[PDB]
């Protein structure tokens with residue numbers, strides 16, 4: 072995570088680039104696992120936050136019906152969604168789909 | 179409960195086949211091809227109920243003597259004049275004709291009403307059979323074009339603007355092969371789902387500072403935290 | 416006091432006064448479903464007082480159709496008459512049409528309003544009573560100072576401006592909406608004289624149900640080219656009934672077999688009436704209702720006459736009026752797609768576009784709801 076954060080905050084350091092490509096085998100292990108987003112963390116320059124994607128909830132996102140529900144959501148927004156409610160709908164997508172997988176993980 | 183009645187009678191048991199309303203995924207599109215335009219469907223047919231009713235008013239005075247379901251008058255001659263059953267004639271026959279209602283009626287052969295008979299019947303063939311059924315023809319067809327458009331809107335506004343950041347395709351073509359990266363690394367919707375998992379999955383003591391921020395922002399439902407315009411690339415150089 | 420106070424009821428109640436008129440027109444005509452002959456008669460498989468409720472409701476309907484248009488006379492009539500004064504007023508100010516342009520013979524709507532400008536009352540419903548003097552002081556010394564001032568200027572019987580009021584109703588009568596409701600009321604009049612043509616009020620559904628107006632608009636916004644297509648079909652069929660008028664005259668038998676007093680429908684009037692009552696209306700082309708050939712010299716010419724008539728009329732021309740209506744959907748759907756695209760792109764006044772207001776977080780919504788927000792300019 073940190074090496075990603077060193078890079079993606081501060082690139083173009085050959086010093087780091089040597090060091091990072093030496094850490095290669097690690098990064099490849101965690102590229103499925105490291106999640107990464109963007110938010111506006113009160114400095115209002117946009118930070119990026121790195122986190123851990125759990126492997127259960129990783130896999131469960133793609134497979135069956137969430138896959139259908141994902142593009143279902145997108146057609147819920149691009150067809151009928153307004154501007155304000157777009158991000159507000161979004162978590163309403165998410166929280167449901169979060170709860171879906173939490174069921175589908177404990178199966 | 180239809181399966182219940184199968185043990186009581188194995189016939190109405192087989193009306194389970196309207197699971198095909200919500201069964202085969204592919205077929206659901208073709209039944210959606212109506213019901214997303216179906217509200218104005220009914221009123222069109224409701225229009226056809228009314229417009230046909232006005233033709234069965236005209237015949238109720240003017241062309242009463244032309245109704246013979248019966249053979250010739252030789253039989254105990256049914257002349258279908260009663261406004262109830264006359265309107266039921268125009269729907270069981272005149273709507274359902276294929277050739278207008280002047281196919282199943284005493285077609286005129288020299289009457290004073292012959293000019294008024296044909297003009298009654300040419301228009302009924304047009305205004306009902308030709309034009310109104312073509313509505314419910316085309317109404318269903320627009321529903322295709324109404325749904326096809328929407329699927330065209332998706333894969334256009336997904337490819338233009340990255341979903342959260344509102345940007346557009348153009349800005350991320352500066353980077354080589356970039357928009358794909360921006361949609362698969364920088365926002366990549368699932369991560370905001372996954373991040374949101376990460377927060378719910380942990381305790382508020384266990385939050386990092388960025389995350390304890392966010393959590394406060396989230397329970398507030400204040401939604402500033404999602405990047406509106408200025409996603410990370412556009413913040414810098 | 417009651418005549419002006421209850422006046423304000425009808426204008427208040429009007430869309431309920433007009434829709435409820437249609438719902439009464441439902442239940443009446445739901446009972447014109449129950450007629451039969453014997454002399455015309457009303458069979459009752461119901462309560463015995465149903466024909467009094469028809470006498471109740473039909474009088475009630477004509478009551479509604481009178482008391483509602485009084486509300487129409489104070490709801491939309493004033494708005495229309497606002498608009499008509501407006502057009503004249505600004506065109507005196509900015510065109511000076513009754514000074515200079517002297518309006519053309521078409522749109523006598525324009526020519527109708529010549530009279531009213533002499534009146535004192537002229538801009539009543541325009542909230543802007545300075546129109547008349549302004550035109551004087553724009554066009555006095557140029558054309559005539561008091562030539563134009565000449566152009567402009569028990570107790571109830573002479574308190575009102577007659578010339579204004581005669582002008583007013585003249586515009587009121589030429590309203591298509593007022594003439595409609597008048598045409599709706601005169602059908603209610605004849606309900607007291609005959610309770611049958613009374614029920615042709617149901618073409619209020621032309622302007623009644625909001626949702627249904629779309630589906631009738633689905634034709635009439637493409638309806639100008641509709642008629643000429645059918646007008647084409649009138650002509651193309653006429654050319655087929657010319658061909659048969661020479662070449663296939665002997666094939667027309669509405670009559671059984673020649674055994675009957677054999678009607679051979681050769682007369683070009685009634686032959687063209689055959690091709691429309693049958694050949695247009697076939698379902699299977701006109702070669703269904705005709706002596707189909709069985710070995711004739713003309714058999715090759717018979718089928719080729721009839722294959723083409725099945726295509727060029729039944730297949731292709733009716734599909735036009737099929738598709739013409741269908742394009743009208745796609746013509747209207749597009750327009751509603753243009754709205755919600757050019758509303759969301761460009762803010763209406765400022766012409767800008769969506770892009771500029773995405774710089775600000777969540778911005779375009781703000782720009783359309785705070786910075787211009789159409790209603791504020793209203």
Ligand SMILES: [Zn+2]
Pocket residue numbers: 340341342343344345365409
């Ligand atoms: Zn984005």
Ligand SMILES: [Zn+2]
Pocket residue numbers: 762763764765766767787
């Ligand atoms: Zn603007």
